[PDB]
Amino acid sequence: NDELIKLEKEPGQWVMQNKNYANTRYSELNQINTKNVSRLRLAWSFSTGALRGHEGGPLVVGTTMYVHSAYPNHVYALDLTQKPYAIKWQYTPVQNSQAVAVACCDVVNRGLAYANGKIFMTTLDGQIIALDANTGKELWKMKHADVTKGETITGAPLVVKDKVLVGVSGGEFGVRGRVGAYDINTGNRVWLAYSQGPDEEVLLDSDFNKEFPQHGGPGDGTKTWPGEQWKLGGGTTWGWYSYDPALDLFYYGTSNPGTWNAEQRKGGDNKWSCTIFARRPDTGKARWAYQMTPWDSWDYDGVNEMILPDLTVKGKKTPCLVHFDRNGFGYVLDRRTGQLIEAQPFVYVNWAKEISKENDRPVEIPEKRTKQGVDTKGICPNSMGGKDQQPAAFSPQTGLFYVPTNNMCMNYEGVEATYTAGAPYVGANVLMYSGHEGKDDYYGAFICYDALKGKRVWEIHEHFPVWSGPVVTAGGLAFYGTMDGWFKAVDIKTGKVLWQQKLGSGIIGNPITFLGPDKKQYVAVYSGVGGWFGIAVAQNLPPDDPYAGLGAVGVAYQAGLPKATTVGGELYVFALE
Amino acid sequence: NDELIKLEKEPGQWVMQNKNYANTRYSELNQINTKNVSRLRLAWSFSTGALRGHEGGPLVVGTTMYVHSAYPNHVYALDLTQKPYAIKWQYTPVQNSQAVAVACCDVVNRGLAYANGKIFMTTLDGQIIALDANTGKELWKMKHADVTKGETITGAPLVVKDKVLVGVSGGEFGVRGRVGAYDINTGNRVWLAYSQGPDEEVLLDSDFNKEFPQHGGPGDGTKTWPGEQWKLGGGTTWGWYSYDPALDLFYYGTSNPGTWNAEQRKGGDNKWSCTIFARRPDTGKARWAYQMTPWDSWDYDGVNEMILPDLTVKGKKTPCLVHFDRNGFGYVLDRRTGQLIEAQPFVYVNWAKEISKENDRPVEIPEKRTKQGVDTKGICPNSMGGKDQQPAAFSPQTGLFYVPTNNMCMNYEGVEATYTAGAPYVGANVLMYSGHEGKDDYYGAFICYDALKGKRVWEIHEHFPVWSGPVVTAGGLAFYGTMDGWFKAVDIKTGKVLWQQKLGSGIIGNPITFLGPDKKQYVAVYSGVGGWFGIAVAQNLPPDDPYAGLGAVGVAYQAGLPKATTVGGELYVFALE
């Protein structure tokens, strides 16, 4: 989109969830820096009027801030010229409350998109809705997903050219993952790109994986599955999307291949679950695809963000894609072709020795691959991954990445799964605990990571998983939140905490930074705990069954989350003086 | 209670809702003052995990802060030694959710009491519950009110000696208002004092009103009503209680006399509705009582706080009771006898010329007394009163009062009412609007008032009603919140605002100030709009019928409250540094 390509360069605005199409989450603003951040204080706050998990973050376009909430997905426009703000408009969609019963991982929403004088939102119950950005008037609404089939929507849509790109959730409900493109003006569906099934549904361009046939090709959407198991094939698309306008490719990752009992998927790779896709936005046709975790047996969803830095590789400036996967590996690919440049662990990994440079496949440790009817113990990372959806940042100044991570392991036993449309299609008993096979007394870490060297530069051990995507700035600072409510600013060179404040609820939002109409720098973040690790608190679940929430309940209680935080939903905005 | 008499003198703690038994809401702390308050900033916050109206405030006892919420009435103990806090324990009572449907005026609760190692809470559904203050363990509980008869509890209980005093709500449901005294050590109900009915139920001491028999006497609880109309007689007890241990008297006010159609109560004063009671704590027996509004036709509940200052009256130090009634008059009584010393308007009043010096009865303006089947227009104040429950403060240094006020008027038409147990028993159509018979463009004011002179000293006009009870301090400051979310510090001498910050939701909490274990002064307040004026927002009500919420919906939309604030539930704590 030509407006967004222009606007995303402005230091004073924040026009899409991860700052720009490259998903760098980097701001050039330097009013707030390592010298003065100790003086940072709350400027103002705003209640979203919702409880449970508040993921994503606000947008700032012009002099208007756009705010979104957990279910029922209230949307607000705040006029920042009104000292400090006034509510310009609000919108709450009508939804089918049955959506709540088929949300796997809390009733979260990762946020709004802006383009062409319009705001775009997704709803838990499967709608994509366009609103007038200045009045809040509903312009069009479309049904993209079907709650009666166990589908929900939690991901933020992406506007590219005249299309709004919308995903789906339900990898634990046997859903056929896909991305739909809807016309920005009418909402009419233009194309629908599936993550499995026949080529006609997957949508492959004539040059698909041309340079890397070893990454797969035509027919693999069915041939790499037993029978018609692909019809329940997962590969959902609830993460963050990115875009390179020069290459005319947009990028995203896909979820686990449906049932968690790999026995019922045996015989093939189960493509294109756990896959990085690069597609043409006009047609949806794939130019390349790389499957990170063939025949997944761990729930290592591949949906984490696809950051698009230009890195110096073997002495030459190279258009890269960088992705910190649930499977614990930090991948660097050539974003033109899907060529694997590097893959090294960014957390402790014990299910695989390495990713092979020969065939780009994981070299598995067989004792850590799961199976039906027999437990597999001490798998690291757990299903929540080296990190979950919480997006990393990249600084072009340092050339390094700032990554929120999990530090947890699990036991995982496959169980026969039976499909009933609208009900869970899992087939696993999972127990979760702290990192390094339960030896660690902490469950998270915030790190600085060198993707090409495949090494951590520094690490901040955090008691709880870090479920907040940092913003990094030219002031030498990274901001992120903790699940017990601390909002922190750290020195990007050393990891030292330079400022912190305890807010009302665990933070699972991704902070932003922008300039107000007063030309002053502000830092804004949601508070309101939830998401998968926070499900025991958000859904008020008891400790009696530690297997509940597919392991999430036990581990949250072990880490002491329910004693550490209440539910909430508040936007906090900070500035100097 | 001897512990509370001792503790209430400590500058660093806040051991009951209005600071002390005299309900002065005054703190001797002066770390924060007129010279430095501009430097005040948020220190920390805590989400209550509930939405809708958050009335009252936290308690600070020792190094523990006790926090309460709107329905379902979560209770938390925060350990303030844990930099800045940790959740020490929490308790959520089991309730009958039918209570929500019979709450007149939002699902608020005015807060906790502390005494003798115990926390005492009330629940919307009619329970009084004693918890261990250090562990949160339930010690005892009793059913005090019955939701099937339209009873709820929203008021904060008061501990006096070895008794916890518990009121009831339901003046709009034909409830028989009463106060119960429960043994703090066992939960046994020791006595139960009704606001109407025969003397055996009202409970009168042998010297009742002996100095002022013109204020009423034996038998008036039935003889001042037509037939047995007293059986649906209201006089509920949902406001703030006060106590003078030197006099062995506790004090409180009573609600409207049930049906809003005065025609059905014609024939007498309807005692003891709209009444100030002084009762013996041992027996519940009344020593004196003064009815402010005989034969009410306006819903002028008498429940507002009974502040117990010692004032110089005609040169003599006098133990006074000062009360800013819903009816718009600022009453000063001798708290030994119920002598009426002074009564003058603290807001614009047009329903009465004055209170008679001859017999202490309002001199009514007949045109403004409401009637059955005919509309009466331009009545000031409206039923929300000169002020509602939001409690005023008194400074012993200045000898003046700092009062949050409403600036609103109404039309009110009596309608014949039919009693159905558990259903509303109102009988009125009420249209509300701004002050001075709808001429004004603002709906509230924060004032400094001289009670003996009967004069405002200064006034700050506020766009919304001021539904927040100030804390006033020896630093020369008054702190209060507005319904569009501004928390403000004013210079008590000039009435100038010296500091303000916009928070996430309208403030209907009453702020407190205390010393942390770090010896630093903090100011704390709930944010989370609701209560009667906020009902359109708290209950998500449309503007279609302006008469809805007994007039509250119309006036809240006219004032623009739904455009100004969202719902919430957050405790904000401020300090210097």
Ligand SMILES: O=C(O)c1cc(C(=O)O)c2c(n1)C(=O)C(=O)c1cc(C(=O)O)[nH]c1-2
């Ligand atoms: O397979 C799926 O469709 C799907 C959807 C979602 C979601 O929509 O939030 C999550 C996951 N999987 C998942 O595996 C997981 O780790 C997870 C965490 C969260 C969260 O917001 O905290 N959502 C999801």
Ligand SMILES: O=C(O)c1cc(C(=O)O)c2c(n1)C(=O)C(=O)c1cc(C(=O)O)[nH]c1-2
């Ligand atoms: O007569 C009653 O029993 C009763 C109860 C309550 C309550 O319990 O909150 C209010 C009132 N009346 C009332 O008249 C009124 O002005 C009012 C305002 C509020 C509030 O919290 O904002 N409660 C009540």
Ligand SMILES: [Ce+3]
């Ligand atoms: Ce999944």
Ligand SMILES: [Ce+3]
């Ligand atoms: Ce009332």
